[PDB]
Every structure is written in C-alpha cells, then in structure tokens.
Amino acid sequence: QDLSEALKEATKEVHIRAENSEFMRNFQKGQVSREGFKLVMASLYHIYTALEEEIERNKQNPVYAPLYFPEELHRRAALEQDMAFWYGPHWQEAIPYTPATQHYVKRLHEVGGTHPELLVAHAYTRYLGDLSGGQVLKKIAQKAMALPSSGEGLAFFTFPSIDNPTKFKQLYRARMNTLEMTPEVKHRVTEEAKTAFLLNIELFEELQALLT
Ligand code: HEM
C-alpha cells in the first residue's frame, strides 16, 4: 500500500474533525473577521517558517529529499508579503506568536532535528491541504473580506510556480511513493500526520477562544 494512500486514509477522520472546529466552521460559512484571519495567518507564518527551516536542514537527506520542492511549494515568502499587507511595514514586531503556535513549531523542530524521517508527515498535512481545500478557503476569504482578484493579502494561497495544483499534487504524491519505506517508518509517518492535524485543531481551538 502506497504512502500517499496510507496517509489520506489515516487522516480522513481527523480531517473531518479539523474542518468542524468552530473556527473553520465559521470560516467556511464566510464569517471570518479581519482580526481572526490576521491571527491565523500570523500563526501560519511561524509554522511554515519552522517547517521550511527544517526542510532546508534535511533537503539532502533521502528520508525527505524526493519532496524538496521549494520553488513550487514554499510559503514563507508569500506569508511575509501577506504579513506586510495585514500588519504593515513593521509586521515583524506587530505579529503575535501564540502558545499553540509555539507548540506546533516546537514539534516541527523536534521532528526536523531528531526524527527527520517523519518530516514528510508535516509537509503532507500542510502542503497537500494547501493545494486542495486551501483553494476553496481562498475564495471564501476573498468574498468575505472583499480581497481583490489581483491577490494582495492572499499570497499564501497563490502558487505562482505551479500551473495546476491538482497535477502537482499528483506529482508530489508519486514522489512520496518513492521514499524508502519500512513498515516501521510508514506506521510512524501516518501517526505523525495525525499529530500534525491535532496541532492544527489545537491552534484553531486556541484562536477561537482568543477571539471570544
Ligand atoms: C473548513 C476547513 C477545510 C475545508 C473546507 C477543507 C477542504 C478540503 C477538500 C475539499 C480536500 C480535497 C478532498 C479530496 O481530494 O478528496 C481537502 C484535502 C486535504 N486537506 Fe483539507 N479542508 C479543510 C481544513 C483542513 C485542515 C485544518 C488541514 C490540515 C491542517 C487540511 C489538510 C488536507 C490534506 C493534507 C488534504 C489532502 C488529502 C489527500 O489527498 O491525501 N484541510 N481539504
């Protein structure tokens, strides 16, 4: 059984739960506020910053290397543009860094520093979702907040080096399936992907509480 299928199957239940967190439910319905959106985007900025520092650390490591697609997928530069848009030119000092974001970042560094064979779980959880449902969420954010089609403020959701998100997803999946894989590693990759999802759910629970 292929890793990319194992992961999708192992995370389908927790995905249903992540979509039905209060924050994403509100989001889905078009009820995102500028404050809420700013909080989540500032949190992703720290998260992707951590994920991508660790992808760099391990880019030559064969437990990750076949998924090294910085030009196409990396999000940090995009989030930096979005932060300047939403928080202004001194965004670096304005943006929050919540404890639930700190927790996710911490685990990202643990995985990247000490269990890099699990980094694929974290890249899967974030990038493949960004290439799928992320595009749906973009449209909702755009309509809710009157964001222009020109893309300012939504650089995170825009992949200028991928023509077709779905084709790239297929490539990414086919490359996932070339990773060297023992039952040990596979079993723990799918577990870690479930933790990645939980860390996101916990971020969302946290943000909702901060907002209400
Ligand atoms: C309201 C919130 C969300 C909506 C509406 C949503 C929507 C979707 C949709 C429509 C797909 C494609 C389904 C398919 O190809 O069969 C999907 C895939 C995915 N989503 Fe989500 N999603 C949401 C939240 C999340 C969150 C919080 C994460 C992770 C943190 C996530 C991660 C993924 C991943 C990794 C995939 C690809 C699954 C695979 O093909 O292996 N999404 N999302």
Swiss-Prot record:
Q: How is it modified after translation?
A: A soluble form arises by proteolytic removal of the membrane anchor.
**What induces the gene encoding this protein?**
Induced by its substrate heme and CoCl2.
Q: Which residues bind heme b?
A: K8, H15, Y124, R173
Key word Zinc present in the record?
no
EC number(s): the record gives 1.14.14.18
- GO terms (BP aspect): angiogenesis; cellular response to arsenic-containing substance; cellular response to cadmium ion; cellular response to cisplatin; cellular response to heat; cellular response to nutrient; epithelial cell apoptotic process; erythrocyte homeostasis
User: What's an example GO cellular component term for this entry?
Assistant: nucleus
Q: How is its activity regulated?
A: Inhibited by metalloporphyrins such as Sn- and Zn-protoporphyrins.
Intervals, Cytoplasmic compartment: 1-212
- Cell compartment(s), UniProt: Endoplasmic reticulum membrane
Where does the record place the site Important for catalytic activity? Answer: D130
* MF term (GO), any: heme binding
Recorded topology in the membrane: Single-pass type IV membrane protein
What's in the keyword line of the UniProt record?
Apoptosis, Endoplasmic reticulum, Heme, Iron, Membrane, Metal-binding, Oxidoreductase, Phosphoprotein, Transmembrane, Transmembrane helix
Domain of life, per lineage? Eukaryota
- Which reaction equation describes what this protein catalyses? heme b + 3 reduced [NADPH--hemoprotein reductase] + 3 O2 = biliverdin IXalpha + CO + Fe(2+) + 3 oxidized [NADPH--hemoprotein reductase] + 3 H2O + H(+)
According to its record, what is known about the domains? Answer: The transmembrane domain is necessary for its oligomerization.
* Family note: Belongs to the heme oxygenase family.
Subunit-structure text: Homodimer and higher order homooligomer. Oligomerization is crucial for its stability and function in the endoplasmic reticulum. Interacts with FLVCR2; this interaction is potentiated in the presence of heme.
Name of protein: Heme oxygenase 1
Organism the protein comes from: Rattus norvegicus (Rat)
**Could you tell me the gene encoding this protein?**
Hmox1
Q: Which residues of the full protein are shown?
A: 11 to 222 of 289
